[PDB]
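Morning, I've got a small favour to ask if you have a moment. I owe you a coffee for this, so here goes:
>
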Amino acid sequence: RPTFYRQELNKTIWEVPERYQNLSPVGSGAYGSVCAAFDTKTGHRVAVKKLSRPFQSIIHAKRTYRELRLLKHMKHENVIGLLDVFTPARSLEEFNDVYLVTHLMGADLNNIVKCQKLTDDHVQFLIYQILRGLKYIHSADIIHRDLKPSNLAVNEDCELKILDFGLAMTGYVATRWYRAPEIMLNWMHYNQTVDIWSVGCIMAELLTGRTLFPGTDHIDQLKLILRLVGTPGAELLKKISSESARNYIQSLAQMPKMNFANVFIGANPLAVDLLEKMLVLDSDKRITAAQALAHAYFAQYHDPDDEPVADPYDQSFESRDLLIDEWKSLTYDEVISFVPPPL
């Protein structure tokens, strides 16, 4: 057990190992206060996040557990990982706070796009890395569910990490713009390829400097989507479980798929082709991350020997019906058993 020291900063108590120095507040909210700090053991600048009250309810307890499990599992260059997790508690009986430590992220991809349309070589490299990370994430049977520019961290060298996994929306709002239509309107039990739709939305925006589907509400968004990709045929309609949703779709004038070379004017033809494969309305027919990596658009970077998959991820706890204290005791074992990564 390391030695902990205790202080109040902006009216939050921080009780952390002596390895973490020069804590300064960078954040507060529903989920957690965050400080930036210097990690003397690794030499990195880090984000230390104190979870507000993680065992407040069965859903929060389970949320905390889920988040911890997920961050413990993710070990890939293009995906956020855990540097440390700790509690000042010396026993299960006094366990209440959880702190997570990750690399301090500077700029997200919004910074990068908001300024301009990018060069094609830049779009290739950035999308390459999202798909590399996504191959890994999907190989573990994990679905991100909330990919968008603010959840992608990018450095000065254009190196990228996927953050902020959706682990359990109204109006003119950025978060909904990147979501696949079947998840946006709950048409069906959805696929990992909801994430591929998101990548297509992001890629389009990188190439044009504009939001692809900036709908003013769910309906206006759908219409934007159907105008580009066409209205569902019979085959897709059959897979939509809500009768009302099917009737709503059949109320709309049918529309053909547009020519994407006349939307993405002047883009690389290989970029146009890849967008056509990602932005397919029927989620059974969308390209997978692994197939997208093999697409000619990424010939400069693709190397199937350097695109690893994840170790199997046991997600059986999601079906498990436990009490608060059982979720808490599982989370405590996960904290105590943490093994840090290599220097």
In short: The domain at 107-309 is CATH 1.10.510.10 (Transferase(Phosphotransferase); domain 1).
